[PDB]
Amino acid sequence: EYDRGVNTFSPEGRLFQVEYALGAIKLGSTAVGICVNDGVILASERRISSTLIEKDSVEKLLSIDDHIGCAMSGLMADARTLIDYARVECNHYKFIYNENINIKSCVELISELALDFSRPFGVALLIGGVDKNGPCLWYTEPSGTNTRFSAASIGSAQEGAELLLQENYKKDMTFEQAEILALTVLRQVMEDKLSTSNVEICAIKKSDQTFYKYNTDDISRIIDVLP
Amino acid sequence: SRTTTFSPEGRLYQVEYALEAINNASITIGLITKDGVILGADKVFISKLIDKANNYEKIYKIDKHIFCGVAGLNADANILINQSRLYAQRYLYNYNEVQPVSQLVVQICDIKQSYTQYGGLRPYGVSFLIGGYDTKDGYQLYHTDPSGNYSGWFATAIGTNNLTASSVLKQEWKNDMTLEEGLLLALKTLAKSTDTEIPKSEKIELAYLTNKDGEVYQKYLTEKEIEELIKLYTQKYIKE
Amino acid sequence: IKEEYNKFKYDITKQAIESLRERIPKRIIFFNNLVNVNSEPGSILNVNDLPSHKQIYLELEKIKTYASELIEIIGNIKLWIQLNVPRIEDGNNFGVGIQEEAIQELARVEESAFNLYDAIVKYYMERAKISTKVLKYPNVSDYQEAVRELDEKEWIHIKITIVDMRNNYIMLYDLLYKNWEKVVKPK
Amino acid sequence: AGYDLSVSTFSPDGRLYQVEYIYKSINNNNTALCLECKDGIICCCINSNMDKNKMIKKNSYNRIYHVNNNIIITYSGFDGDARNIIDRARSEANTYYYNFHTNIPLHILVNRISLYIHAYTLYWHMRPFAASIIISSFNEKDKGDIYCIEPNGACYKYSGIVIGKNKEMFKTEIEKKDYKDINVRDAIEDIYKFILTSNNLQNLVNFSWICKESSYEFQNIHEEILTPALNKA
Amino acid sequence: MYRNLYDTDNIIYSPEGRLYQVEYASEAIKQGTCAVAIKSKDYVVVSGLKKCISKLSFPQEKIFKIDDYIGISMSGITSDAKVLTKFMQNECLSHKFLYNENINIESLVRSVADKYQKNTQKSSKRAFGVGLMIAAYHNEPCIFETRPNGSYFEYDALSFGARSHASKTYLEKNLHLFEECSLEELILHCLKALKCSLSSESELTISNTALAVVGKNHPWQEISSLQLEEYLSKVK
Amino acid sequence: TVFSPDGHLLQVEHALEAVKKGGCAVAIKSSNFAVLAVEKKNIPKLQNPKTTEKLIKLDEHNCLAFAGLNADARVLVNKTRLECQRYYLNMDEPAPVDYIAKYVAKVQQKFTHRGGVRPFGIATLIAGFKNNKEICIYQTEPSGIYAAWKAQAIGKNAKIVQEFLEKNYQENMEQKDCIFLALKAIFEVVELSSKNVEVALLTEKDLTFIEEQEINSMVELIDQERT
Amino acid sequence: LTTFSPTGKLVQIEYALNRVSSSSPALGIRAKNGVIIATEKKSPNELIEENSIFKIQQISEHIGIVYAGMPGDFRVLLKRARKEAIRYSLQYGSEILVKELVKIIASIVQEFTQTGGVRPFGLSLLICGVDVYGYHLYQIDPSGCYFNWMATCVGKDYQNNMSFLEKRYNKDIEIEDAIHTAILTLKESYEGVLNEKNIEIGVAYDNKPFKILTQNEIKDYLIE
């Protein structure tokens, strides 16, 4: 049992303090993002169990910039620190270079901040955007592994949504094709009903190259198609 | 462990031991009268070879109108007095007026609070009854702890045997108290706290403010308290 | 079946509170009325009021009643404490430590009352063997004194069992009462 | 009772543990050798690590370094930690060259390198070095001198010294022949005979000699003089 | 008193004489994917096998680029390998700015191996557990590699942890690469190493084996997504 | 501060439990005002004003009633009042409640992520005004999380008082009706002593207290409502 | 990092007090016309020259100090004591007061207790000297506190060594009469009966500058 130091190794060639946070990201709310040939669509839950909440102050899909949206999981208090850092460097990039930052260049900097050697950030993201070369979707971890995903899922119920996307993802799916697909995986792993308040989808179209949060009115026309 | 770590109960360890470390120290009495605040003390006697006539280490002076009666680690007490004297003078250098005690305890409890939060250093095993006079709200008497949670009072008896001596002030204290009647009131609680009936006078020290529009702030000599000790004999404001 | 099981967990909780608020205090006073704490020294543990010894037999019969009622009460209480321990986790499990200490004390008292059943069998078996020797060797007087001393020994053990019973009952109620908030909530 | 953890802890016996383990660390690494001659100072370095790689270049793994044209330095131990001392050695020569416009002498460089190795031993957070350093040179007027720097200072002048995995073996082979007055061209053939005693016919022993009246400056191995190895006698 | 005291600290040494914390990093590179490079007379080809973590995922990159004639291929953890890439990129680019000549290969790896050394004596910073593989060509194509402890070895062929023993044995008996001047036979010889050292019953090279070449009139040209499956990923 | 082998934080969960041993404090939102409530205790015939232990101001329109460690609020408030005034100096606008709450949450988060610093064992709730004429009562925990509420409560046994508030919470109330709802939260201190509850009515961007005279007229009506 | 203890007392300070309870005995006694100090100089042999190893050093022309603990620490605290006797003498042209000086050294000793990774001072001081407010004889505790003593001892076995002073001391004693009551508190207190110029004695010498009494000078008093 080696747990005192933060940078200690293992006789089997493995880290220890990083691996503790690997299980911490499996306790947050579930989320799922699909990268289609026309854009990127995200989805998440809204654990607003106590009705006294404002329901708008708590959000799971913040924005890195106007062209890059992302999800959150794990420690919500630490997830905001990385998002605030991403909102600086991505905006700082626009001040230096006139073009929008590339996700491959943005996820690599969002992962280097999880290399503080404090403590590693126990948070996994689902950064997606349509920066250049079409739309891309990335999924980072506290260990620093940045793997570009076509359709992934993070949260407490990310295991069930993993095999569902493998049996449902098709390369020739449009926005409205995946929009129903982004909800059928949420209908499976859900301890409630897919109402017009628990789901908070948003997408980034390739045409306008900007993200637009799907409000309560627009999601009602998509949750009632019954996949 | 260190002071940075918490405990599963929610309390702390280093600041909890310091709260108990002052319980094994000499007692001090605080008392607000209708003329000025007065303080008490208990000179712990290691031997009879101390000076016992010129000095006493239980009541100090912060400013010309603010004074405290310390109780706890006598070694660590000298740092805060050397730290409170600067704040009582840096306020004068920055605002050309006296500093209110309400703005002094906040300036001094934060120096204690800063130690029980970071640095990995031990806290200050000290707690004192600091009182003074101000133009904003008259005489006042505050009380700090090793954690920093200060609170105003009328009478406090920290040191050793607090719960017994504080109960004396629950009944014998009155809203209207003159300077001479307040001294006799604070003299009995200072004596019965040590399970004795009369002070040896080569013991306890008292101080009093009583602003006569100039904040005289006179201290007491071993001969001046003899008249106060004699008045306790005739009029006994007993234990009860 | 799912209903009957959930009913049981509900049924346990009811029995536990009833025992701590009524059944246990009543027994504290009950055993105290037999061996009052205010008695002067030597007036309890004596032998002044002393074939088989029919008098000791009658005292043991009351003991067996006392032993039966004690074990039954603690057993549901022990299970009840077990039903409130939260999921095993690393760290912030100070409450399970409180919980474990309570379960430990309950099992200890249970072992004490449990040993009375075995101890009573030992009395009759041991007394009979020495008595056979008295019949075989009637003039060695130490065997008859041994019989006398054995009754005096058993008489003392009976009363020490009752005082330990009494003292455990108050100690159990007082212990659970102080840590009650951690006893009801899991963590 | 486990007192050899940090470097600042002194053993109750009086010895300094956690630094004596480094000698057991250099005793498992490859060896190096050097010796005095009447014509120069021939060096040697055997890299007994043939059974695992067999893919490295023939003359790539060189363990002979020089601060300038007339002072050679070798390693024995952790090859990674020795790079840091060479950086402190060349910088010591360059700092001495700026402030004094001359080549740094030997008796003032060794005393400055030994201080650098010893300085990391005193710290409670920095780990000590794990490399024994052989420093030698050969004056034109005066003869050569070889300084041996092991961990925990101890700069000692030698006349022939071997450090590595067979220090108790090759030491007995040097005291046989008085190398103080022979040559360099014959000792190089004698050195290759010693390695065959204690383990194959391979050219994994790269070494150069500082002086053969070749302007009295550090040369290379000069392969043509190394290939006629007396592999039988 | 042994087996658990001299294990978790980068400062303490074992009584035998082995820094066991750094020795774990050398074994930490074995958990990564395989890689192999071939040094010909005038060209150097690097074959790297990516690792598709999931069906929906994309294979993470293994072979990188540093300069026009310098390209590395990590094998280990992506956390520390990316840091050494930026340190090697800012170093070589500064050499083309401060001066005009290209950076010497051995003078570059000496700076990279020194980066491992600086993260070995301090108690706070740990060692970079990553097996670098620097392949470059300046005047003679040389291939260098590092370990957690500072090292350089002008290798002629290598392997990295997945099935290195099955791959090292293939390269031990294949030393004719120096005369295989034809680039086509070189890339088939390098890809044959992975084919004879892959896992049991796995997909051979389904466009998931990164390949890169570098040489005389060749910069760090990444082998395109079409030139490898036409005939190179079809010969076997 | 490091992680746990399963994924939690022993230095944060301990601090979050440290606020449970503190005086309760309840807040309640309304249409254009937000009355607060706190329940403290004092020794009789001594400690006249309790140095205004709760209901601390931050600006002309931002009240704050913390809960928990009384000594750790001074450093939290002084590091907040400074930031509330510094924002007014750089943006020439009185600091909105959305910025103060986003600052107090960043202060506590900056203390758990760093090493060798004890976390702020204090959970607060800020009630102020946004940029438009709106009122959103926030609530921050020592972990760093924060969310708006329509009613919230923190302190000793905050679950039983927040649960009661979840049922009879109307949408829009009257100034006296909203006080009665907050005054129906004496489910923490037995016998409902008038010398224990302290309420303040934050209205029309100008905070003010509530005299004990009208307290007795409202605290006595609760005893004649349980029958 | 010398933290607290559950009993409410510093454990490293209590351990530091044991070191001064097992060193050479230091003794100071005030009078009505000066203050005297004494120290039992444990001479191990005749190789150590007496003019090098000392136990009575000066701070200024009117302040005397005595050591009672770790001999290696007999200089570092002295350097900061003389430095404070200069920093006060630069600004204020007059002499440094003993109460102004002892409160600074007590603050220096204090900072070596609360600082992390440090060790408390293993010694007890005895500052004495002529002041414009009479005479003074203070004693500094490794904890950081200071006492305004009148006659005290701090060395080994002082529980019974002070007993000679509790019964053989008057409030009005001259400095010449206090010498024999101090020698009696050293020779007749414990072993070291061969007191033949093996005791260092400093005096205030009735408002004159601090005088370190020589061996032959003490010999005049050593005959009784």
Short mmCIF file of C-alpha atoms in Angstrom, two decimals, chain G residues 92-214:
data_model
loop_
_atom_site.label_atom_id
_atom_site.label_comp_id
_atom_site.label_asym_id
_atom_site.label_seq_id
_atom_site.Cartn_x
_atom_site.Cartn_y
_atom_site.Cartn_z
CA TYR G 92 18.57 56.52 20.75
CA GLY G 93 21.89 58.05 21.81
CA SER G 94 21.55 56.87 25.39
CA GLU G 95 22.12 53.39 26.78
CA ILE G 96 19.85 50.42 26.18
CA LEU G 97 17.46 49.75 29.03
CA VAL G 98 17.37 46.23 30.42
CA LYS G 99 13.59 45.96 30.09
CA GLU G 100 13.83 47.17 26.52
CA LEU G 101 16.60 44.68 25.80
CA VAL G 102 15.16 41.64 27.54
CA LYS G 103 11.84 42.05 25.74
CA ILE G 104 13.62 41.79 22.39
CA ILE G 105 15.69 38.71 23.24
CA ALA G 106 12.54 37.14 24.65
CA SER G 107 10.90 37.86 21.33
CA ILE G 108 13.83 36.30 19.49
CA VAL G 109 13.62 33.13 21.60
CA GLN G 110 9.86 33.06 21.05
CA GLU G 111 10.17 33.05 17.25
CA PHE G 112 12.25 29.86 17.52
CA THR G 113 9.24 27.98 18.87
CA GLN G 114 6.42 28.88 16.51
CA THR G 115 8.48 28.70 13.32
CA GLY G 116 8.25 25.41 11.45
CA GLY G 117 11.30 23.18 11.29
CA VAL G 118 13.26 24.90 14.06
CA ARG G 119 14.55 23.90 17.48
CA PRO G 120 14.03 25.92 20.67
CA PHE G 121 17.03 27.44 22.40
CA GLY G 122 18.70 25.09 24.84
CA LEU G 123 19.70 27.68 27.43
CA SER G 124 18.47 30.00 30.15
CA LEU G 125 19.74 33.55 30.31
CA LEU G 126 20.42 35.85 33.23
CA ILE G 127 20.54 39.47 32.11
CA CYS G 128 21.67 41.90 34.79
CA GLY G 129 22.88 45.45 34.93
CA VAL G 130 22.64 49.03 36.09
CA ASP G 131 19.63 50.92 34.80
CA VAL G 132 18.32 54.45 35.28
CA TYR G 133 15.39 52.89 37.20
CA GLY G 134 17.53 50.99 39.68
CA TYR G 135 19.05 47.56 39.16
CA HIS G 136 17.60 44.54 37.41
CA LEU G 137 18.17 40.80 37.11
CA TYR G 138 15.97 39.07 34.56
CA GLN G 139 15.82 35.41 33.59
CA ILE G 140 14.90 34.19 30.12
CA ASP G 141 13.13 30.79 29.79
CA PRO G 142 13.48 28.73 26.58
CA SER G 143 9.71 29.03 26.19
CA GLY G 144 10.14 32.75 25.62
CA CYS G 145 8.83 34.16 28.87
CA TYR G 146 10.89 36.29 31.20
CA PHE G 147 10.74 36.89 34.93
CA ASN G 148 11.74 39.94 36.95
CA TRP G 149 13.67 38.02 39.57
CA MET G 150 15.50 39.30 42.63
CA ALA G 151 17.76 36.33 43.42
CA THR G 152 17.65 33.10 41.46
CA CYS G 153 19.48 30.06 40.17
CA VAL G 154 18.85 28.19 36.91
CA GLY G 155 21.43 25.40 36.76
CA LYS G 156 21.37 21.79 37.86
CA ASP G 157 19.36 21.01 41.02
CA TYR G 158 17.87 24.44 41.56
CA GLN G 159 14.88 23.21 43.58
CA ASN G 160 17.13 22.96 46.63
CA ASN G 161 19.69 25.52 45.48
CA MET G 162 17.10 28.28 45.69
CA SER G 163 16.33 27.12 49.24
CA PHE G 164 19.56 28.74 50.40
CA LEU G 165 18.35 32.02 48.95
CA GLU G 166 14.84 31.73 50.37
CA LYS G 167 16.28 31.69 53.90
CA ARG G 168 19.61 33.54 53.64
CA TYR G 169 18.57 36.69 51.84
CA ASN G 170 17.42 40.13 52.96
CA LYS G 171 15.98 43.00 50.96
CA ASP G 172 18.82 45.37 51.92
CA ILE G 173 22.16 43.64 51.35
CA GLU G 174 25.28 45.35 50.09
CA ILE G 175 27.13 43.99 47.07
CA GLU G 176 30.17 43.06 49.16
CA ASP G 177 28.02 41.16 51.65
CA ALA G 178 26.10 39.40 48.88
CA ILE G 179 29.30 37.85 47.50
CA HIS G 180 29.74 35.51 50.45
CA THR G 181 26.08 34.54 50.43
CA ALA G 182 26.49 33.67 46.74
CA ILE G 183 29.68 31.67 47.23
CA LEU G 184 27.91 29.78 50.02
CA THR G 185 25.12 29.05 47.53
CA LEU G 186 27.77 27.45 45.27
CA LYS G 187 30.33 25.74 47.51
CA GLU G 188 27.98 24.65 50.31
CA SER G 189 25.23 23.73 47.83
CA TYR G 190 26.71 20.66 46.15
CA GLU G 191 29.97 19.12 44.87
CA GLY G 192 32.71 21.44 43.67
CA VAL G 193 34.15 21.98 47.14
CA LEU G 194 37.61 22.71 45.67
CA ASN G 195 36.54 26.22 44.71
CA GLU G 196 39.95 27.73 44.03
CA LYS G 197 39.55 30.32 41.24
CA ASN G 198 37.04 28.10 39.43
CA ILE G 199 34.06 30.46 39.72
CA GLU G 200 33.34 33.40 37.42
CA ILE G 201 31.68 36.36 39.14
CA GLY G 202 30.45 39.53 37.47
CA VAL G 203 29.14 42.55 39.34
CA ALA G 204 27.43 45.81 38.55
CA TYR G 205 29.99 47.46 40.87
CA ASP G 206 27.80 50.29 42.32
CA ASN G 207 26.80 52.08 39.04
CA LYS G 208 30.28 51.83 37.47
CA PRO G 209 30.77 49.86 34.21
CA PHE G 210 30.45 46.08 34.26
CA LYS G 211 33.49 44.46 35.87
CA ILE G 212 34.47 40.81 35.41
CA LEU G 213 36.24 39.89 38.66
CA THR G 214 39.67 38.33 38.18
#
